[PDB]
Amino acid sequence: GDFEEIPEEYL
Amino acid sequence: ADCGLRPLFEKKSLEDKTERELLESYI
Amino acid sequence: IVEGSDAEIGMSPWQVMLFRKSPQELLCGASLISDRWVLTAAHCLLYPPWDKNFTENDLLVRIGKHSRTRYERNIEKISMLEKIYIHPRYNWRENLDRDIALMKLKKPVAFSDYIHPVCLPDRETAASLLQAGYKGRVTGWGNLKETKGQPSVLQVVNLPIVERPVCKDSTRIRITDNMFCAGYKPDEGKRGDACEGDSGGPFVMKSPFNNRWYQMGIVSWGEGCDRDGKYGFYTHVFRLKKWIQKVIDQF
Ligand SMILES: *[B]([O])([O])[C]([C][C][C]SC([N])=[N])[N]C(=O)[C]1[C][C][C]N1C(=O)[C]([C]C1=[C][C]=[C][C]=[C]1)[N]C(=O)[C][C]
């Protein structure tokens, strides 16, 4: 919940 | 090459708020 | 970082964040030394006492960041790892001697106002700047203390290099020539130190001869954080430069 999601072009 | 030269500081001849502290210690 | 302050925008554009894919977390700090090579501490990737042995696809590298947790759209760049290289004589069994490792990026990262590589010291620059009293700068998204917790943004703190006998006399751990310690003494008043989560990030110095930033050390270890009488230990980058060059040259 700490970190905001990385856009999925990578992750 | 261009290494160690910050675009937002050295490249523009702007100093950050505490880099002087470093310089003052190099005696 | 403990007793530091918020970093200015683009103040450390070689700052890199080692991020674990799942569970999604900050693993360590690192630094950008070229458009395809990242420097960090070996123990950030390999530490068998704690059952840590990350492979390439376990990690990601986030470059040009400021905020610790937010996805900095249009600013930060995310890179995958092609290969990890740990010093062959990295001593994880005893005292973290030669705590250094390189990570080759899958593709070159594009430099910007927030992304730019730091220089690595030659013998003279090292000889001239790595002296007791001379201050360096450490940056990271690590803990703010020993029990707030974690920063909202990249932290910075300037700390003086400490005399080798003082370093040695402050700990029971066997110190080597591949390390150097920094921080203020109890009688100096001023405080500051790296902390848990800052490992792998850079201890830099701005040369007064050519006004360029050089990475002299890598956050390695310390007994607690910002404890009176204790000092932060860093990997002596110049001392392991021949290995660094060999890896980059060969690979
Ligand atoms: B890092 O991974 O984020 C962390 C930084 C620690 C504080 S640095 C400071 N105050 N300047 N690095 C460590 O935890 C390393 C990795 C393995 C253990 N280690 C330590 O700092 C140890 C001391 C030590 C143990 C074994 C070999 C060398 C040194 N510190 C403690 O034991 C845990 C707090």
Provide CB contacts within 8 A for B8, sequence distance 6+.
B14, C9, C10, C11, C13, C113, C114
Query: Could you tell me if C17 and C7 lie in one domain?
Result: no
Query: Could you tell me if C7 and C127 lie in one domain?
Result: yes
**Strand residue runs (E) in C41-107:** 46-47, 52-53, 59-63, 77-86, 101-105
The question of whether C99 is a catalytic residue gets the answer yes
Q: Cα–Cα distance between B11 and C63 in angstroms, integer?
A: 19
C95 lines ligand 1 (CB under 6 A): yes
Distances (CA, A) of C103 to B18, C36, C251: 30, 8, 11
Residue C218's domain comprises 1-12+118-238
C137 C-beta neighbours (distance < 10 Å), count? 25
| Resolution (Å units) | 1.8
Elucidation technique? X-ray
Q: Cα–Cα distance between C24 and A1 in angstroms, integer?
A: 9
Query: Could you tell me if C106 and C159 lie in one domain?
Result: no
Ligand 1 centroid from CA C220, angstroms: 7
Query: Could you tell me if C60 and C40 lie in one domain?
Result: yes
Q: Is the peptide bond before C23 cis (omega within 30 degrees of 0)?
A: yes
| Overall number of domains in chain C | 2
Query: Could you tell me if C139 and C161 lie in one domain?
Result: yes
The DSSP annotation for C128-179 comes to: HH--TT-EEEEEES--SS----S-SB-EEEEEEB--HHHHHTT-SS---TTE
Ligand 1, atom 28: closest residue by C-alpha: C95
CATH of the domain at C99: 2.40.10.10
CATH number of B1-27: 4.10.140.10
Q: Give B7 to chain C, closest Cα distance, Å.
A: 5
Query: Could you tell me if C141 and C69 lie in one domain?
Result: no
> Would you kindly state where each structural domain of chain B is located, as residue ranges?
1-27
H helix runs in chain C, sequence order: 123-129, 164-168, 241-250
Query: Could you tell me if C52 and C175 lie in one domain?
Result: no
C104 C-beta neighbours (distance < 10 Å), count? 17
